[PDB]
DNA sequence: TATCCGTGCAATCGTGTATGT
DNA sequence: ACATACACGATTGCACGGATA
């Protein structure tokens, strides 16, 4: 008891999203999911918006401290490491099976709209924590000569993260159809290659 | 006569983009639409049914507009395809349509397997571009466009992407920066990857 | 008379809160 | 904490019934 139900009770949440999206859910189905009625779950949230903010919300502060722990030890530089940085999150998005449900279920299984105020908190929330990273090694970077001077940085920081959600989309949406393991390191590859030589991401 | 069917399914196309797929009942689109549900049951038998019919309208005047600015274009195959491309995200702010058919299949409909009309219309517009991002990579190389070595696999899965990166960036973004600029950039770095990266062949 | 569209009603489903250990 | 019971709204599907041309 105790923490245990509530621990039983996010996953089976987590895992009852992920299967059957969030609008069709009920919160019944989250109850039998886990091996309690509603009674249990009305004690632990709020409601079905307080149970998914209080669900996503600690996801989204695991993601950002598996980051923080993956990139702060600095093994060669910062340029070289925000690459280790990447691919680590890409390869945590096929091993981490709590990672992996938390972006297939925001770019999939829920609906962007004013109304579910909770999901674009979280949408926000998700693209405020990279958008801070991004800028924080890029300035770090042409601070220590690694790309250009006259980076264009506020073009950049959207190219970064615009190619890397498109390789989180088309993995999900082709229904993980081609090997997430050899493709994503080509395309950081690529990406990192494009802010240290292409003109175009300058002004 | 037939300006109610019309006006039902238009009407369905707007509420879908504001409130989402789900939390739109049948009620809110008739009464959208000047109506009520005994004209909206008596043309489509429920949502999914009226969902279907709306969005594979939309998806067969893609595919002509994606294939009419195609024969349209005299030049080479790898030169009049960053022109197919340039338009599309040209119509993603001219043609109202079109930007509500991909905003509501990119951030306001759920891609799970209930939802077999949205899942249906989603692999719709994958083997359209499938089929021509294939078809113009088979004859660049053939016009020497591109290197013989191109890895034809991964150059389209690259290319599709970079082209659903920007898409989905731009929407969840909530628009907030110029499509008509950054959208040939990143096209034209995109482009220049598969004439000269390494990783990019076998 | 067939097509078009509004109206009334049963019936299911999800939620919220009170009730009882 | 957790299970159970009740009270209520929100949609759905088909009953129709009226209208038109
Ligand atoms: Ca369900
Ligand atoms: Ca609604
Ligand atoms: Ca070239
Ligand atoms: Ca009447």
Redesign the interface.
Known sequence: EALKTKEHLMLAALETFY??????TSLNEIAQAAGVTRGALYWHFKNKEDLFDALFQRICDDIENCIAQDAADAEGGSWTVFRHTLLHFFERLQSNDIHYKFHNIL???????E??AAVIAI?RKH?AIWREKITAVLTEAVENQDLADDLDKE?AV??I???????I??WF??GES?DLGK?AP??I??MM??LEN?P??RR
């Open positions: 299967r059957k999206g969030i609008a069709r770019f999939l299984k829920c609906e962007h709209t109304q579910n949408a693209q073009t959207i190219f993260k615009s190619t890397l959600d498109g390789l989309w088309r949406s082709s081609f493709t080509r395309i590859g690529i290659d494009n292409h175009c991401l």
